[PDB]
Amino acid sequence: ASVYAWNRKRISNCVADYSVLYNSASFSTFKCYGVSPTKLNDLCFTNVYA
């Protein structure tokens, strides 16, 4: 989306793999706050919003 009206997807009822995301080193940054990108795989959520 254009940032004036950014898109948002709710993610729910599923099994994630943040290691696969963190391994996509084409990502120029993966800066995190309140969590470390490794530990995401041990940890889980009511919802994730992208």
């Binding site: 963190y22 080193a25 470390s36 990108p37 490794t38």
Partner: protein, 47 residues
């Protein structure tokens, strides 16, 4: 200690870092006492 990597991965060369280098094959201890010194070598190490 000395070696070559992709420049994107220089961030992994520090105490307590993680990823495909720092997990497997060049872990630095959390109380490391020293300096990490790095530079682009595309003029030498690309073909």
């Amino acid at each position: 200690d000395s070696f070559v990597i992709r420049g994107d991965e220089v961030r992994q060369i520090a105490p307590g870092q993680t990823g495909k280098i720092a997990d497997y094959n060049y872990k630095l201890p959390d109380d490391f006492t020293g300096c990490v010194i790095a530079w682009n070598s595309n003029n030498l190490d690309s073909k």
